[PDB]
Structures are given as structure tokens and as C-alpha cells.
Amino acid sequence: KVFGRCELAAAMKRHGLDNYRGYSLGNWVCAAKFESNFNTQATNRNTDGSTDYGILQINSRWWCNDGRTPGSRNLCNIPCSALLSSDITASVNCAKKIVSDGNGMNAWVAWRNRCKGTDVQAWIRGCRL
Structure with missing residues (x-):
């Protein structure tokens, strides 16, 4: 599934991600x-020898697992494919x-x-919500 700016903004808000630990939607x-x-x-x-699945790209070796990554550890204890839900949840x-x-x-x-040193408004400007 795809997620437009305003939709993702509303989603990131319903999830409590905007400014989560400081990570404002602009960063996300x-x-x-x-x-x-x-x-x-x-x-x-x-x-x-790993692959990244999920909207924000998550490696199947240190972040999550997929069941095929040639040797994986998993620090999130979660199934990578699930990161491709229709919900960023x-x-x-x-x-x-x-x-x-x-x-x-x-x-x-x-x-x-591209973000940790550039701008955090060009990714939210408009969806002022």
C-alpha cells in the first residue's frame, strides 16, 4: 500500500510518532x-546477506526477521513482511x-x-495537522 503526505501525517499522529522521542514527522x-x-x-x-522490508526499510538481520535472511538475529523480535501492512502500525x-x-x-x-542535517519542514509543510 502507498501513503501520501497528509495520510502518513494523520497515521504518524494516530500512532504517536510525531515528535516521538523528538523524531518529528519531518524526520520520519x-x-x-x-x-x-x-x-x-x-x-x-x-x-x-539480508533484505529490508517495511515503509521505513527495516533490515531482516538486526531490526527484524523474514525467515530466509541467511543468518538473522532480530532485535525488534518481529516478522519483516508484517512491516508491509496497509497500516504503518x-x-x-x-x-x-x-x-x-x-x-x-x-x-x-x-x-x-538527507534529513539529519537538512530540513524537517519540507516533509510536513502543507498537512499542518
Whole structure:
């Protein structure tokens, strides 16, 4: 499923993600924007031997598991495919848990430099809610 700006904003709010631990929707939207463009299908692939599933892209080795990743640990204790729900609730639930290890989002490559050092309004401007 896909998630437009206003929909994702309302969703991120109903989930209590806006400013969650400080991570304002601007950070989540900017990150999710270039990562999967708010999509519950845009999947990525890691060469080490893992794959990322979920709107915000979650690795099946340290964040979640899929049952095929050649050797996985899982720190979120969750099924990666579930992160592709039609509701961000799946990834938001694991994200709200993952954003509490110590590195937080200091790993997602897009957010790392495209957001953690750019702007946090261009990803919310408009859906002033």
C-alpha cells in the first residue's frame, strides 16, 4: 500500500510518532520519503546477506526477521513482511521499539544525511495537522 503526505501525517499522529522521542514527522517523512517514498512495498536488498522490508526499510538481520535472511538475529523480535501492512502500525510499532536501542535512526542512510542535517519542514509543510 502507498501513503501520501497528509495520510502518513494523520497515521504518524494516530500512532504517536510525531515528535516521538523528538523524531518529528519531518524526520520520519524525510527518511521514509527517499527510503521508500511512503510505500508498504518498496523493498531494498543488503549485500551482506539480508533484505529490508517495511515503509521505513527495516533490515531482516538486526531490526527484524523474514525467515530466509541467511543468518538473522532480530532485535525488534518481529516478522519483516508484517512491516508491509496497509497500516504503518506494523513498522511504526517496530520503529517505536527500534528507536530505543541507542543509535535510534543514526543508521537509515537517507535520514542520516538527507534529513539529519537538512530540513524537517519540507516533509510536513502543507498537512499542518
